[PDB]
Symmetry: C3
């Protein structure tokens, strides 16, 4: 799985250990080994949410499977909780786009997962 | 709806007010209120189009519905027009990927829109 | 086609010629004219892969057609090879998401490719 957060929160406000916390929490949430979890945080972005430049985040979670109605509700609670606690971003200023990827459409290690 | 633009145009060439103009015009174009619109501009990027480093842009528009052939032609005219007028990017050096998101695959405020 | 690479490798470690090589090799691999190839490299990113912040890359290839099982395996060998040779990223620390875009869902030059 791959989780990306783009945010206008400044770099210095991203706490040490945030990438490792995201890795462990997403490994637990997706049921996949941490070795497969990729995380990417992009601070200092020029972005607005609802016309406002107060703290916000635009995010995506891609996974081969483990994506669906109830699962995505759970991921949204988990990830909004982490963004609120660690980055001080209100959950109503976060969007997360979820992508269920087919194995043939994910390259890795000179091939794909197909 | 969520609109992202990545461009090699420098930050100082992004005019004041641009995020608000994008918010307003996308609200009108999609039929969703400004409150739902997120916009994200990423200047100073290392990118080429057709092998050339002349000004260019790679963009995304994500929406739950309101995506389709005629609508996407209209969005492209609107958004290429804005990028040409405000960022001086030729419309033939812009790509915009459109994504019709399922409500269950969009998270916000601790849940999803399903 | 459009290829994006996000990496924690620093900007100074991206060699001169990288975007040009990606453009030429992707034109060759996809069979599309280089005039239609867009490339984008984003170094200096805060990211981790599998619990490690050693060099890694999260990438996307979007194309109208030219996407499929065998084609994506070939692209992954080509692109992981380039990332290893030029950026010193191990191929097992690379993810590439492939997207077969409908022509009506790609804006360009004030319209779509439909
Ligand atoms: C971002 N959204 C949530 C929201 C709801 N439905 C959607 N439905 C679709 N199809 N797409 C998106 N993006 C949607 N987003 C959003 C943002 C701000 C207010 C808002 O300012 N509400 C007023 C009025 C209260 C109310 O909405 O009941 C307020 O003062 O809080 C509502 C919704």
């Amino acid at each position: 799985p791959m989780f990306i957060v783009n945010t206008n929160v400044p770099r210095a406000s991203v706490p040490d250990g945030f990438l490792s916390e995201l890795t462990q929490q997403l490994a637990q949430a997706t049921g996949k080994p941490p070795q497969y979890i990729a995380v990417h945080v992009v601070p200092d972005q020029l972005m607005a949410f609802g016309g406002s430049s107060e703290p916000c985040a635009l995010c995506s979670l891609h996974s081969i499977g483990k994506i669906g109605g109830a699962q995505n509700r759970s991921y949204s609670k988990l990830l909004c909780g982490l963004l609120a606690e660690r980055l001080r971003i209100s959950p109503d200023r976060v969007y997360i786009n979820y992508y269920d990827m087919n194995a043939a459409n994910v390259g890795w290690n000179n091939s794909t997962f197909a």
